[PDB]
């Protein structure tokens, strides 16, 4: 209600320690800030985490009460509900690891829990569809910024960070800092005055760029007809991780016929990014899928692997590599993608039967489901409506991208793993290029042999960080 002044009261924050490294690390913890007034789900709490040494007037790491940067991962997953997330936490999902490592790096910690897709409110109907997750993201963010100086850290120092959806909801936030669009739902949330633009942004296999998903997926699966992936199964357990029995199909010929078309649209949208090299040179695809752009996704590949074999890894796990004496020179790119596997079937984002988490996120209270594209609107399976086209485009990072703006984050860190199908390489490189396009400070790869996954180079994110910071 109003009565939640959103102050923050460092008097709320109580001693606990976790064991990190052999070494106790200990910290100090204020949980469940109700962080607007006027939340719709119970999830709408964020909890706040102090190295302990910032309330003794002491340091951490170079770093001091004032200074600390503020780390905002999310939980957030297949567009799915994030929980406030605790160093404490051990039920899914939950990087209660990485927390107890940023806190011995002297990071604050602000875990702010998100509403997703399947988030329903006191009556039972959903509101935690599009663009619930950013909306959530963004009010915890002005939260944070409102406190600035109550609450331990510097706000003008926060570092988003999230896997997969909330690697995309992490990006997004770095985008879309004081966006026009967002305002009245902030305002009808209670959020606190505030800016919600961001320092830096840290990426894991963001997946973003959903319209244009589907035409990437096929541009790189084109030519590889079976799909492998996994699938629900249960049994109980104690801190409810869902499991994941497997399944595996053949692509009919509708679906390769779809294939072939979302590959051949994928040269037409790429070629119209006037994404460029940094020789200048535009970064292309003919009508065939191959061209410049193609050989920049194999480079980063080509480097990936480099840099795994120059530590003794057998890079031949995988097809395709050329190795000449201690160099790789080159890859066979169709060699490598058919030994990583297909994953998704087709449409991989869009489906035409309404049944992705993607065409979920895009429902809202009145439609479980709807399609994000015109072709899987025009090919529809079931009755379908499309989403709305503006928030479609305010949801995508690259929307914001298109100029130097002071309101997006200057600073960006994106993986995404060489062995992740999820969404093609293509996504995340496009990303990583129109930032480098356009001045924002890039740091990208694309790590050896890593699956759908994040928070797995913890050491080189935090140098990164103090890198920025100190
Ligand atoms: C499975 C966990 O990762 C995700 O967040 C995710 C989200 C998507 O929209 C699609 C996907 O393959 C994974």
């Not at 915890?140 to 995309?168: C, E, F, H």
């Not at 040179?281 to 003919?286: E, I, K, R, Y």
């Not at 061209?291 to 692997?305: E, H, K, M, P, W």
């Not at 297909?342 to 065409?359: G, H, I, W, Y």
Request: proline share 5%.
């Amino acid at each position: 209600s109003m009565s939640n002044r959103l102050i923050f009261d460092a008097d709320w924050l109580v001693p606990e320690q976790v064991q990190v490294a052999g070494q106790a690390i200990q910290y100090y913890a204020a949980r469940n800030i109700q962080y607007v007034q006027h939340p719709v789900a119970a999830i709408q709490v964020l909890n706040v985490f102090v190295p302990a040494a910032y309330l003794h007037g002491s340091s951490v790491n170079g770093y001091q009460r004032a200074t600390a940067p503020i780390l905002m991962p999310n939980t957030v997953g297949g567009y799915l509900p994030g929980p406030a997330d605790d160093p404490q936490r051990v039920t899914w999902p939950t990087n209660a690891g990485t927390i107890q490592q940023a806190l011995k790096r002297g990071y604050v910690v602000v875990a702010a829990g998100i509403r997703g897709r399947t988030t329903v409110d006191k009556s039972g109907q959903r509101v935690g569809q599009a663009p619930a997750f950013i909306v959530d993201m963004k009010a915890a963010i002005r939260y944070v910024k409102y406190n600035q100086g109550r609450l331990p850290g510097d706000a003008n120092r926060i570092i988003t960070n999230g896997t997969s959806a909330g690697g995309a909801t992490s990006a997004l936030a770095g985008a879309s800092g004081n966006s026009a669009y967002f305002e009245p739902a902030l305002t009808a949330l209670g959020a606190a005055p505030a800016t919600d633009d961001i320092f830096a942004v840290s990426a894991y296999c963001p997946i973003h760029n959903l319209e244009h998903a589907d035409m990437a997926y096929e541009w790189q699966f084109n030519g590889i007809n079976d799909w492998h992936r996994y699938q629900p199964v249960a049994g109980t357990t104690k801190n409810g991780r869902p499991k994941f029995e497997p399944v595996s199909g053949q692509l009919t010929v509708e679906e390769q016929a779809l294939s072939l078309a979302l590959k051949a649209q994928f040269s037409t949208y790429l070629n119209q990014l006037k994404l460029t090299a940094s020789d200048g040179t535009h970064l292309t695809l003919n009508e065939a899928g191959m061209g410049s752009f193609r050989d920049v996704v194999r480079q980063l590949l080509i480097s990936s692997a480099q840099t795994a074999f120059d530590q003794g890894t057998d890079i031949h796990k995988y097809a395709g590599f050329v190795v000449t004496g201690n160099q790789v020179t080159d890859l066979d790119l169709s060699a490598y993608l058919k030994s990583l596997t297909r994953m998704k079937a087709v449409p991989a984002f869009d489906q035409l039967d309404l049944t992705s988490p993607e065409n979920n996120l895009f429902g809202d209270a009145t439609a479980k489901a709807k399609h994000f594209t015109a072709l899987a609107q025009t090919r529809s399976t079931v009755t379908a409506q499309l989403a709305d086209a503006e928030l479609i485009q305010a949801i995508n990072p690259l929307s914001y991208l298109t100029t130097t703006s002071s309101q997006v984050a200057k600073h960006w860190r994106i993986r995404h793993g060489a062995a992740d199908r999820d969404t093609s390489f293509a996504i995340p490189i496009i990303l990583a290029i129109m930032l480098e396009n356009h001045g924002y400070g890039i740091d990208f790869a694309l790590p050896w042999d890593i699956p759908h996954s994040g928070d797995y180079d913890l050491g080189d994110l935090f140098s990164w960080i103090d890198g920025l910071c100190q």
